[PDB]
Structures are given as structure tokens and as C-alpha cells.
């Protein structure tokens with residue numbers, strides 16, 4: 303599913319991501335925009351053989367099981383395919399574990415490089431929430 307910007311913002315809020323670990327909703331929308339262009343079915347293979355899955359490009363090296371990432375963990379206790387669903391629940395729940403792991407949203411390199419310190423509120427500007 304390819305979300306609209308305000309559509310994603312509302313789904314993220316309903317699932318409790320707004321101000322989760324102190325990160326406003328625009329942070330989460332910005333991260334999703336540059337991780338997946340709001341496409342839930344986005345996948346990208348990393349050099350190290352792991353894969354990133356879904357709207358927030360959650361990596362199989364630590365967080366989900368895809369059966370093809372040797373020596374990896376599954377800390378969200380889910381199949382990576384569950385992060386590709388049109389329903390973002392599984393991605394949100396896993397993202398909450400990720401952003402609580404100590405480094406905040408810096409876990410998402412595209413957030414650090416393209417969202418952090420910018421006017422992230424623009425991503426929710428105009429949306430009915």
C-alpha cells in the first residue's frame with residue numbers, strides 16, 4: 303500500500319507513535335518518507351546480506367526473521383513479511399522497540415541524514431488530526 307502523507311500521519315497517531323519516546327509525529331512521517339516513500343511493500347537488501355522491510359525499513363539483522371540472515375536476531379518476534387502489510391500495526395510495534403533501544407531515531411540512518419534537525423512539522427502540516 304502506498305500511503306498519502308496525511309493518511310500515514312493519522313495511522314501512526316492511531317497506533318500511538320505520536321510523541322513516542324519524545325518524537326513528534328512529523329519525525330515519524332519524515333522517516334517513512336525517506337525510508338520507503340510511504341510504500342508498505344518496500345524491501346532493500348543490504349551489503350551484509352540482511353534486508354530492510356516496510357514503511358520504516360526495519361532490518362532483519364536484529365528485528366525480524368526472514369530466514370536468510372545468518373547469525374541475526376528477531377527482537378520484534380515477527381516474520382519480516384509482517385512488516386510489508388497494508389496494516390502498519392506490526393511495523394509500528396517494532397519501531398517502538400527500535401526507538402527505545404538507546405539511540406532514539408538515529409537507528410534510522412535516513413532519519414539522521416534527512417530529517418533530524420529539519421522542520422519536520424511540515425510533514426504533518428495541513429493534516430486533519
Ligand SMILES: [Au+3]
Pocket residue numbers: 326327328329422423424426
Ligand atoms: Au511534528
Ligand SMILES: [Au+3]
Pocket residue numbers: 362363364365366367368369371374375376
Ligand atoms: Au533476523
Ligand SMILES: [Au+3]
Pocket residue numbers: 367368369370371372373374
Ligand atoms: Au535468519
Ligand SMILES: [Au+3]
Pocket residue numbers: 323324405406407
Ligand atoms: Au532520544
Ligand SMILES: [Au+]
Pocket residue numbers: 313317389390391
Ligand atoms: Au493501522
Ligand SMILES: [Cl-]
Pocket residue numbers: 313388389390391
Ligand atoms: Cl494501518
